[PDB]
Structure formats: structure tokens, C-alpha cells
Structure 1
Amino acid sequence: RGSFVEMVDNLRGKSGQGYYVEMTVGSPPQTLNILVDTGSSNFAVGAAPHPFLHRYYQRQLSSTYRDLRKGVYVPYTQGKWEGELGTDLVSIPHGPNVTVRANIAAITESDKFFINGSNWEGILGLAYAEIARPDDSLEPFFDSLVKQTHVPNLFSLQLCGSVGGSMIIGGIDHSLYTGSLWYTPIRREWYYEVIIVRVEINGQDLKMDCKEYNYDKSIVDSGTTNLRLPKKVFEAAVASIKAASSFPDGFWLGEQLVCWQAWNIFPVISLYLMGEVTNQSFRITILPQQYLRPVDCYKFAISQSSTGTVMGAVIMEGFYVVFDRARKRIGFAVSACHRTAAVEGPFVTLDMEDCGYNI
């Protein structure tokens, strides 16, 4: 229950290109490297010899593949992916010793989806059915896993910033963190939505209506690199970090990098998250090591958003993060692989419910 040595160090990546896990699809098993994404809900894999791909799902070679005779189209601002739906047998070699029949989108056409020079060929959407495409009737991978096996309904991520990490499927590994886990409620089961109730720069409150910290929504998303903040909050955050570190104007907007010869002028950032108890919150503290990401040239790893707050790899790399789906909560503890990053509580915060934005 608290030890999963087989699953420790099962993630790899390249800086800025996400974290991936080895998976097998079909019979006989086809090995594929798959992007771990808590911000989406489709299991989708390259199914055609796109030039950027080391390998791809060859449906014709699999005796257990079943055609669902249905297309799926996922548009982005940039480009897109498009594919054909089916089911097949799926395993995770460095995961639980089980095999499940899962939905798979065989990607037949894409634009700006596969990265030139990356070592992954698909995406594993770990979020809920509600945001699955084409609709919520397409059961996500993790739902299928839980429905078909005795694997407990939770997973955890230790993202260590080329890069490596651990995805513990069905449990928690206590050697992957120090101190205690602190839990924040999943507000709704679509994205991993949470509520930020207070933001501090260097220990100083931003003094904003907390509703705006979640304007639209706040999510935990392993497929995003940056800490993304709502426009107005980003505005205030930058203005406060700027004043704490008194650099070009375009650097703050992510329009150009800044280079130095091969930290203390930059403040710590505390996010207070809604706790499990009425009027109780806790805080996570991230270092400038987290929001200043090397590409010695660094890209300011905080950016504005029109889709709400996104707690991406920047945040997650400082912490062991538990996606406790059974109890509708997300746990945070100091990573045993990350001034140090901190998770602290309890704090008294009133009117935390008001911080959630409603349609």
C-alpha cells in the first residue's frame, strides 16, 4: 500500500516537452512512449508513419483490436489531432501487473501535435470523462483500469526536473516525499479542478478578490509546462515580483529569453489552497528555481491565461502530487527530489467557497 519499487522512476522526458511513460497496446504487445497528461481525458496514439515518430500503433498487427467505427477530432489554437476510435488490450510494463481493454484513438492526421525530436508517440489523458472527446460516453483509460481490475482509484506523480520521475498507479509511495500530505478538494470531476484562496509573493498578500485566482477555473495539469495565471492575477503577480526584484519588458510576457553567466533577488511564491475542513486551508511554496526554467538562458515560467489558473510542471516538480480520485481530493507534499519548497498548514481562511467561479 505504501511501497511500489517497480513504479519508482518509470517516467522520462525532455525539459519543456513533458513527461512520458512506457505503455503496451495490442497483442502481441506494441511498446509506445506516452505523454502523461492530467489535463485531458483521451488515450490517443500515433497510428501512422509521421516522420517525427520513432514508432506508432499498428492496428493490423493486433489480434485483439476492435473497431468502434467512429471518428474523433481535437482542435487547438495551433493545430490539432484527428483519429479513429477503437478498443484494445493495454498494459503498463513499469506499472501494475494487469491488462485492461481500453478506448484508443488511433491518430491518423495531426498538426503541431507531435514534437520534432521528442521520444513520445501518444498522450494518456488522466482526467475525467466530462472533457473526453467526442463526448463523456468515451470512458477514459483510468476509469477502464479501475472498472476492470482491483487497482485502487488513485495515482500519484513525482515529477523531477534529461528529466525523470515516477507515476505510482493505484497508490502512494512514502519514500517519494517528506513531511506530511495536505489535501485540497477536487471541486468538480472534469479537469482536476481545485480552489486557490490566497496568493503571496515573498510572504506578502496580493489582496485580490480570491474569485479571480480561479477566474474561470484552477487546475492541476501535468501536460502544461508553466504556471499559468488569469490575466488580472498575472498582472498583479508580475508587478509584485518586479517590485521584489528591482530586465526587458518582453521577458515577463514570455516574448524573449534572458541569459546569464554559468536566485535570491527573486521571491518565493505561496499558493494557499482550500483544505478539507471548513475555514481551513494550507499553503504550497515554490522557489524561483521552479518559475525560472532553463532552455544560461531562462524563460520566465509564469504566463497569462484566458482559461484560468494552470498548475503545470513548474509547480508540480516541487511536490509529490496525489490524485486521490476515490476521495475527490488532491494531495501535496514536499518532493524528496525537488530556502526549500514547502507545504504547510493548517491556516484559517474564511469565505473560501466565494473563491470558486460559477458559470
Structure 2
Amino acid sequence: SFVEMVDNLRGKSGQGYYVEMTVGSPPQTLNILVDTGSSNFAVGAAPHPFLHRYYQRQLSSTYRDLRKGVYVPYTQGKWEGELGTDLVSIPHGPNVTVRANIAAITESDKFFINGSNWEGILGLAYAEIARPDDSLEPFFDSLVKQTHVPNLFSLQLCGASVGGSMIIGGIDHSLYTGSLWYTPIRREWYYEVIIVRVEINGQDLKMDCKEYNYDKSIVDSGTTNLRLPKKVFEAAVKSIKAASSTEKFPDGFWLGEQLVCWQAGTTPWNIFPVISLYLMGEVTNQSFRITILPQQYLRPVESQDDCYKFAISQSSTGTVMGAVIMEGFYVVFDRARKRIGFAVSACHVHDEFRTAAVEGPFVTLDMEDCGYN
């Protein structure tokens, strides 16, 4: 039942959304970071200063050694470990147990986060970007093949410590308002999408739409920020800076290195612009937009001051639509129909005079020119 899966995600602010899972026989309970930017299911399997628990392969009767090493690099960090298979279930997911590939993490560099409360990672993207190669079947592929769970999952990330829902095998209509707007998954590797237009406070950024997707645009639950290609990032900061030029910020703030603080409850939300990302739609020459509020990209960092970090950052590997984007929305990863749905979520962040919105339809000619090759 879908109700059993509502509120199945937890986390600390700025530290990651995790789901509870069990590995092995008898079941070993671990908290697992939900990550749509990768395809490897991996858990801590050796003592680590940031870990309070880990996977103990010697305690599992259903553990099978695959006799093969693996390393997975990410933008922020990396780990290496030993491949194996074991029985896996999700307590607040579908009522099933599957045999899935698990990477037992033996060492890592800047991977685990101190106090984050998660001990592993669930890579939900496709086999193509799985390590060591595409022959290592991702967890969700194993779930769908072994059970009758439909080939779809949705993520409701609630920011505003942190919580939300991962509905596995379907769409829970009580978790969003309005209608769902779908953008094609361009290629089945990352959850790749095409951004066709960008507006800041209703003003078109007016760049060649290829720049927005240079060299790719992905939807990623494992990344905190809205990450933008160099040229786009610089055009965005220039606009946000112009709009908030009334107030005083160190320029290291715009790089995410320093915080800005305000007397508690006096945050000048009005001076920071809304950002609209127009995504390719389902029919010819059609797009739709998703609008984010400053409350999404100015993230509260925990005195009676309200202090924030600028959570729009630069990237040299394309646009990353991280938690900044996803937190406003109920996001449907419709793998069966090769599309990603966006709707305003029931736990959307509140501005007094503005709203996070999913709106359409829009006309956009030559949308296929926006994809980078």
C-alpha cells in the first residue's frame, strides 16, 4: 500500500535524504541515501569514524561473495569496496525481498558525512552508469525483474529536521496538488532532461538553450544544490546580485563559502528572485516551467540570527537539478514511459506573496536544438 510508504524518508538539513533498508539474513537495518545521480547500491561494511553501524557480511547466511573489487567516484567524494549479493528489503516500501548486488564499502574519501545518520547509498539511475560496468544490475532493476513492483518511483523531498516520501512502484495523488507535467528522459543513463529556457523574475536569461544543457542536464536527489554550467551560473548570479543589490553580501557568499545572517524573522525574501526552468514537454513544440522560490536556493545553516548559504553553484559537467529544485516538487521517475513528472508538492516551502509552481503548456520552437551532442 502507498500509505505505508508516505513519510519513509528522513534526514538532517543539508545532509541527505535516506530510506530504511535491511540487508542479509537475519536482516541488518541500515539508513540509505536516496541517489538518482548514480546506479550503485553500496553500504559501509567496515568501521568508519562517521559510521555508527555497518554491514557485517560474516553475520549473513545469504551473503554471496562476487570476488570482484569496485570503486565509485562522485563529484563530492568516492569509495571502494568488494562486490557481493544479498537479500534486501525496504521496511516502509513494497512488501518484498530481493537478491540484489551490494558493494561492501571498505574504504572511502569524503563520502560519509558526520552526523548525517545514513550508512549507505541507493543509486537509482540506469545500468549504463553502474560501476564497474553496465553488467552490474542496479537495485531497482533487480526489484522490477524479481517482483511485480511497477517500473516507476516518485520522490517527495520536504525541506523547510528533513523528511519526505519515496513511493516505490507508483504515484500517490495525495502528496501533490494540481497536475503532473512530464519531461522526456532523453537517454537512459543519468536521469537526463532538456532545459529549453531560463527566466529570473520573469526576465529571459536569453542564452543559447544549448548552454543550459552543456554538456548534460540531470535530475539528482543526491546533490544538494542547483548546479549550473559556468556560463549559465555567471549569468544567474549576475541577475540575482542585481535583484538583491539593495543589501550587503561578501562575494564569497556567492561562491557558497560564507553565510549571510539577518535578525531572526527579518530575512528580506522579497529581494531575491524566483527562478523558472522550462523543460521539454511531451508533445511537439511544447514545454512547461517549474518555478523555485529563494527559500529553496538560500538554505538555512544552523544566536537569534537566521543564517543562509547560497545553494546555486558552478559545474563543469552540466546542469544538476539537486534538492534545491526537487524540494519544491513531487517528482515522478516514470521509467516505464521514459519521462519525469513534476507537480507542486503538498510540502512546498511558503512565501507570503509568491508560490513554487508547475505551469503549462508553453510553446517552444526548436527544442531539440537545446540538447548537447
Q: TM-score, normalised by structure 1?
A: 0.97
Give the CA deviation at 1:74: 2.1
SS of residue paired to 2:131: coil
Unaligned runs of 5+ in 1: none
Give the CA deviation at 1:38: 0.3
Residue 354 (structure 1) aligned with residue 369 (structure 2): yes
More deviation, 349-358/110-119: 110-119
Distance 1:341 1:76 in 2: 30
Give the CA deviation at 1:78: 5.8
Give the CA deviation at 1:76: 4.8
SS of residue paired to 1:179: coil
Distance 1:149 1:118, change over 3 A: same
Percent identity over the alignment is 100
1:187-222 C-alpha deviation (Å, 9 max, x unpaired): 000100000000000001000000000001000000
Q: 2:277 aligns with which of 268, 271, 276?
A: 271
Distance 1:334 1:101 in 2: 35
Give the CA deviation at 1:25: 0.5
SS of residue paired to 1:240: helix
SS of residue paired to 1:239: helix
Give the CA deviation at 1:141: 0.3
More deviation, 8-17/240-249: 240-249
Aligned to 1:310: 320
Distance 1:146 1:89 in 2: 15
1:102-145 C-alpha deviation (Å, 9 max, x unpaired): 00000011121111222110000000011100111000000000
Unaligned runs of 5+ in 2: 348-353
Distance 1:146 1:289 in 2: 36
Distance 1:288 1:79, change over 3 A: closer
Give the CA deviation at 1:79: 4.7
CA RMSD of aligned residues (A): 1.0
1:316-350 C-alpha deviation (Å, 9 max, x unpaired): 0000000000000000000000x111000000000
Residue 235 (structure 1) aligned with residue 241 (structure 2): no
SS of residue paired to 2:66: strand
SS of residue paired to 1:243: helix
Give the CA deviation at 1:80: 2.3
Distance 1:177 1:211 in 2: 31
Give the CA deviation at 1:34: 0.3
SS of residue paired to 1:223: coil
Distance 1:208 1:13 in 2: 37
Return structure 1 stretches of 4+ with deviation > 6 angstroms: none
**Conserved 8 A contact 2:16-2:116:** no
Distance 2:324 2:111 in 1: 21
Q: 2:24 aligns with which of 1, 16, 26?
A: 26
**Conserved 8 A contact 2:214-2:229:** yes
Distance 1:190 1:285, change over 3 A: same
1:163-208 C-alpha deviation (Å, 9 max, x unpaired): 1000000001000000000000000001000000000000010000
Give the CA deviation at 1:23: 0.1
SS of residue paired to 2:238: helix
Give the CA deviation at 1:252: 1.0
Distance 1:75 1:93 in 2: 29
Distance 2:77 2:200 in 1: 36
Distance 1:77 1:234, change over 3 A: closer
Give the CA deviation at 1:243: 1.5
Distance 1:77 1:356, change over 3 A: closer
More deviation, 236-245/184-193: 236-245
Distance 1:331 1:78, change over 3 A: closer
Give the CA deviation at 1:157: 0.3
